[PDB]
Design a protein around this ligand. Sequence first.
Ligand SMILES: NC(=O)c1ccc[n+]([C@@H]2O[C@H](COP(=O)([O-])OP(=O)(O)OC[C@H]3O[C@@H](n4cnc5c(N)ncnc54)[C@H](O)[C@@H]3O)[C@@H](O)[C@H]2O)c1
Ligand SMILES: NC(=O)c1ccc[n+]([C@@H]2O[C@H](COP(=O)([O-])OP(=O)(O)OC[C@H]3O[C@@H](n4cnc5c(N)ncnc54)[C@H](O)[C@@H]3O)[C@@H](O)[C@H]2O)c1
Ligand SMILES: O=c1ccn([C@@H]2O[C@H](COP(=O)(O)OP(=O)(O)O[C@H]3O[C@H](CO)[C@@H](O)[C@H](O)[C@H]3O)[C@@H](O)[C@H]2O)c(=O)[nH]1
Ligand SMILES: O=c1ccn([C@@H]2O[C@H](COP(=O)(O)OP(=O)(O)O[C@H]3O[C@H](CO)[C@@H](O)[C@H](O)[C@H]3O)[C@@H](O)[C@H]2O)c(=O)[nH]1
Lengths: 387, 390
Amino acid sequence: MKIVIVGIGYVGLANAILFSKNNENEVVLLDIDENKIQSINNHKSPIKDKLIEKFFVQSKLHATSNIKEAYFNADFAVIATPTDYDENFFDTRSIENVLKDIKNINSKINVIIKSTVPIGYTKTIKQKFNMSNIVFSPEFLREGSALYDSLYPSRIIIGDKSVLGKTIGDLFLKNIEKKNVDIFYMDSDEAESVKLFSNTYLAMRVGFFNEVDSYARKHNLNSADIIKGISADDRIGKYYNNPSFGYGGYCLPKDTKQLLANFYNIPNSLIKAIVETNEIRKKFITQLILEKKPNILGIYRLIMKQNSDNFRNSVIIDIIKYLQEYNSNIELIIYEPLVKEKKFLNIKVENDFNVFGAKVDLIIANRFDDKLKEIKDKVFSADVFYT
Amino acid sequence: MKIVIVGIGYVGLANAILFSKNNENEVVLLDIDENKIQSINNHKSPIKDKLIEKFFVQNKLHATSNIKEAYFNADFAVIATPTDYDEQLNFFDTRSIENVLKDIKNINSKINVIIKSTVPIGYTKTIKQKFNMSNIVFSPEFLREGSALYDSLYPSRIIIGDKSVLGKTIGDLFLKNIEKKNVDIFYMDSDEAESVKLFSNTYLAMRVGFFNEVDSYARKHNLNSADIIKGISADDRIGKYYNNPSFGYGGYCLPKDTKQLLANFYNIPNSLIKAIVETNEIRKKFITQLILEKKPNILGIYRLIMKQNSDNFRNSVIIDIIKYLQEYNSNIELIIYEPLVKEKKFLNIKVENDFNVFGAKVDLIIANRFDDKLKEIKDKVFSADVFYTD
Ligand SMILES: NC(=O)c1ccc[n+]([C@@H]2O[C@H](COP(=O)([O-])OP(=O)(O)OC[C@H]3O[C@@H](n4cnc5c(N)ncnc54)[C@H](O)[C@@H]3O)[C@@H](O)[C@H]2O)c1
Ligand SMILES: NC(=O)c1ccc[n+]([C@@H]2O[C@H](COP(=O)([O-])OP(=O)(O)OC[C@H]3O[C@@H](n4cnc5c(N)ncnc54)[C@H](O)[C@@H]3O)[C@@H](O)[C@H]2O)c1
Ligand SMILES: O=c1ccn([C@@H]2O[C@H](COP(=O)(O)OP(=O)(O)O[C@H]3O[C@H](CO)[C@@H](O)[C@H](O)[C@H]3O)[C@@H](O)[C@H]2O)c(=O)[nH]1
Ligand SMILES: O=c1ccn([C@@H]2O[C@H](COP(=O)(O)OP(=O)(O)O[C@H]3O[C@H](CO)[C@@H](O)[C@H](O)[C@H]3O)[C@@H](O)[C@H]2O)c(=O)[nH]1
């Protein structure tokens, strides 16, 4: 049985691995990025940070840009290509590019959309392509625990109640490790809702605990004490409650603005504030840095959490832009090993840590790590639990 | 060893029983309402609570309105008087606490005072200074009405807003009398403790606010709310609890505590805090618009309480819906089924406590929560209840 994964990002690569670790399945990764295809076929993970990166070193797997080769004789196709939101613009052109290829080569491949889409998208795209063999099943994995989250999903959501739905459902149950998983079958608009609203809840919770931290900072109260006290209510819980410079990453900022596009022309809403509180928190962090009046500022890591490959839409890049807007006279210096060029966004990169720590008045880091501990004293961070 | 509990309410009564079960404590409830004092003295729980009734069943406490009698030789006083947010003047009302501290200061200024009533952030620090008493400790209450004593015996955690040995005495006093084994207890300064309470309630209001906005969206687009909410809640970071949509969040405390924190969020262009309050009012007006779209001629209100277990409807969201209905379309004839109401009318609305006549009289029934009785009439019943948690 042949499975095509379209897109070698975090979602596609984790799903490719999930389906390939059992000898019965032939898995093919399809992309337009020949760098990604060339990496895979050299048994290197293009996504530099993979928890279970033991998979590549110790189940076979094949990548190609060849539409013909991939979809030829394929039973399922998983669409894991980018979807963005740009303004109100719902960018799904990668999905329509794949579906157009799929409808050309062969149309009866059972298509699973994993990329996050607008509510009502899947029902619309089936009508407009004249294809009923398309099922939306959202993806809930975290970057940098992608394959773990794929083997042990929180739950499986199948946006189809027909027999095509149960078909897609059994395909995932028979390949995940997690057992007695919650699996919910529902119509497609409901599944798309589950995804946008789930991410919007998580954004809201981060926004909540950062408003707590902001409040504590303005009145010079102990944040850890307050958050620990709040979180001991089991209805609130001791997790996912560590203040930061703000929520970011690839999806939460996009998906919250998505849902807010649906929530226009009502006077206010949690959905609007979930977006707006994040920008206020980032500007407040910036104001706090300015008040320390540094002359040379070191940005420690462009990533947000320390188990992260990338800084795509990292909050700390937003902090850089706010610093540049409110006081371009503050010289900024980045310590970020992942960047090989020595200017990122016109800011000097200094990947000698000793030179970086000595050069700067003040270091801002979203999260502490042991490498920062030596110079703890010049470090500004909202990190409370050191997660 | 002698503990005075001030306020015979949900918090006071629960704490008073919490301490009197232990027969080495002498426990006195002190109140201004002679009706509630009478009831207590007649071994009569003036409220309803499963474990509270069982305690009164099993076997103790005494009540009075004489402050000299209560406070004489008291080691501890627990203040459980009402704190209100009053919309006029945008302020939280703490007079009751100050009236009680004045009595304490004049009769026995050295009683160890424990404030359980919810107060503004910074209150206890300022009130210790204003009365010149450092023997005052804030310790928030987290009980839910109708599980008040279970939550007292088995509290999620203890928060003591004083890091000195007096606070250690207060925390240790609660450890002794609770039955929850190996409970989380946090010592912290008083502002942080006041912050914990207001923010914890604000989070809960936020969560109800969130799942109602989900329900609102789903209704606007004819989607299945139960599907959507179950799929959301299956994420263990979100959780399968405290997520049942409704006409809006209500009760004594959530509506006042969120508005108080919002006041203490001075001049912020937007915030979760402000939205948490505003979304509740939008949800309520949306519920009302939905009811009116059904163009009922005679509308039945099933219960004024928020939930079956409750036996009170102070700040019940049902009543806000009633008031919006009266404002948006005064032509609909409203009828209330509420056995807790003994008078012929409430808010000038006919009360019909014969369930037979009520169900036949009306074209459509609104109920915040389904119960046993309504399944028989389910087809003219409008509710946002998704899980029938009753
Ligand atoms: N990043 C996450 O943690 C996460 C989690 C859940 C859902 N999602 C959703 O999945 C989508 C993909 O996430 P990602 O971060 O793994 O993507 P990504 O940006 O890391 O990579 C997507 C891949 O798709 C390739 N591609 C682009 N257009 C293509 C086309 N027409 N045909 C074939 N391949 C094409 C790209 O070359 C790229 O390699 C997100 O946009 C979002 O909708 C992401
Ligand atoms: N009700 C809850 O679920 C809950 C939970 C946690 C905290 N709290 C906090 O506890 C406070 C009280 O809650 P409640 O439900 O018990 O309120 P309640 O109104 O039912 O209890 C008030 C009692 O205190 C009496 N009282 C008023 N003034 C007094 C005075 N000067 N001296 C002595 N007694 C006086 C009143 O006569 C009344 O009997 C709330 O305002 C809230 O701040 C409530
Ligand atoms: O305690 C916390 C936890 C998270 N964050 C920030 O919130 C953002 C989201 O973090 P996280 O949810 O841990 O990782 P993501 O890779 O962004 O995954 C989220 O976004 C994915 C994209 O859809 C979803 O599939 C995941 O379930 C969802 O967790 C990040 O900026 C975090 O740094 C905090 O500030 N404090
Ligand atoms: O899934 C849910 C849960 C609650 N609510 C509503 O939210 C309000 C408050 O509900 P609940 O918290 O269950 O009862 P309370 O007795 O008001 O207790 C709250 O208010 C007290 C603050 O004083 C705290 O001590 C408690 O921890 C806190 O739960 C009520 O209107 C509920 O009907 C919903 O609509 N859906």
